[PDB]
């Protein structure tokens, strides 16, 4: 249920192509995103594609250097990137999209790809006690926030993310009650309450910016529990 696959080592200025196989759900009906991951920092939105192949958008970080792809038939999401720069290191995820409310639900595991600021405002960390009230607010613009509904994701250590909360504040099949999203114009924020030991993660609150066109991803907040 999504593999990545065709990472390496590259040289600046070089060429590269990924791939990600689909398993479980049919593959043609949702639009599929790569999201990349730097070494050891947050999340970074790269390019999507409609199940259509209709509506493509890139990363302004990426714009006209890669090129996403799909072949519905064969079941797998393709990458193709060039001119690719030291900076373009990172992990690549490919995330199946919600056609309904814009949300991750799938991610894969990651393939890494080696060469040898945001506009929206987490805090980087979070401390808090085992049983106490813990809120993560993420502050976005008139453009992003203000106007589209936010996703939050909850990555834990090595693991790729989870969809933690979307729609605003709908918890997915799993999530559990302890866990509850808002949004109050331009801010959104994230609430756990009664913090438990496991909630040791790393949390990233997503908007569609319909400005930039482009997904906007939170500078993340890394949850300590005490």
């Known amino acids: 249920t999504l593999k990545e696959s065709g990472g390496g080592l590259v040289k600046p200025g070089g060429s590269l192509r990924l791939s990600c196989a689909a398993s479980?759900?049919?593959?043609?009906?949702?639009?599929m995103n790569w999201v990349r991951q730097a070494p050891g920092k947050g999340l970074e939105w790269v390019s999507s594609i409609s199940s259509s192949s209709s509506y493509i958008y890139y990363a302004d970080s990426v714009k006209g250097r890669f090129t996403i792809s799909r072949d519905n038939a064969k079941n797998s999401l393709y990458l193709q990137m060039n001119s690719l720069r030291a900076e373009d290191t990172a992990v690549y995820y490919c995330?199946?999209?919600?056609?309904?409310?814009?949300?991750?639900?799938?991610w894969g595991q990651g393939t890494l790809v080696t060469v040898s600021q945001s506009v929206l405002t987490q805090p980087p960390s979070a401390s808090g006690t085992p049983g106490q009230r813990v809120t993560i607010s993420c502050s976005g613009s008139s453009s992003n926030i203000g106007s589209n509904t936010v996703n939050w994701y909850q990555q834990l250590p090595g693991t790729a993310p989870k969809l933690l909360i979307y729609?605003?504040?709908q918890r997915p099949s799993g999530v559990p009650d302890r866990f509850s999203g808002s949004k109050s114009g331009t801010s959104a924020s994230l609430a756990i309450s009664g913090l438990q030991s496991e909630d040791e993660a790393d949390y990233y609150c997503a908007a569609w910016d319909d400005s930039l066109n482009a997904w906007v991803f939170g500078g993340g907040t890394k949850l300590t529990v005490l």
């Open positions: 995330a199946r999209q919600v056609g309904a409310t814009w949300a991750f639900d799938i």
């Open positions: 729609s605003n504040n």
């Open positions: 479980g759900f049919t593959f043609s009906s949702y639009s």
